[PDB]
């Protein structure tokens, strides 16, 4: 019952949705970084930078 989903067309379907589903993670993460002000990742960022460290 897993099994159904494995084949040339599904391989094709996977690939056609790859740019999108990784552009969504890019949305997701930048989104998550901004909304919490994360520190670790945001120290790296060449304008954004001068809000804590001074």
């Amino acid at each position: 019952m897993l099994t159904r989903f494995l084949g040339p067309r599904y391989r094709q379907l996977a690939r056609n949705w790859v740019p999108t589903a990784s552009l969504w993670g890019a949305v997701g993460a930048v989104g998550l970084v901004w909304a919490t002000d994360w520190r670790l990742i945001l120290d790296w960022v060449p304008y954004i930078n001068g809000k804590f460290k001074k």
Binding site: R4, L6, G7, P8, R9, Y10
Partner: protein, 105 residues
């Protein structure tokens, strides 16, 4: 053939009796979970078997209600359990799976 497959048959017949749907007049296929394939097979059943199917299930839901059982004569025997659905179920599935292979290419 031999003397060992009638222990497997004996164990089968035991579990059957333990399952105890026969105590309410039911055949094995009366008791199948109605999923999508199963629903189609009930649909494909001819008028006589559907009509007997519904009466069986009406009987047992009635007993089941008044928390009773049938007399021991009128229980369904293991031998004699009529699997009327299976040929239809097999065929519905056979088709679903052909569909599923076509969907892959």
């Amino acid at each position: 053939v031999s003397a060992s497959s009638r222990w497997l048959e004996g164990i089968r017949k035991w579990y059957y009796n333990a399952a105890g749907f026969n105590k309410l007049g039911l055949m094995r296929d009366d008791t199948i979970h109605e999923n999508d394939d199963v629903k189609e097979a009930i649909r494909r059943l001819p008028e006589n078997l559907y009509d007997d199917r519904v009466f069986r299930i009406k009987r047992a839901l009635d007993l089941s209600m008044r928390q009773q059982i049938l007399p021991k004569e009128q229980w369904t025997k293991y031998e004699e359990d009529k699997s009327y659905l299976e040929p239809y179920l097999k065929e519905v599935i056979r088709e679903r799976k052909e569909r599923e292979e076509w969907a892959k290419k």
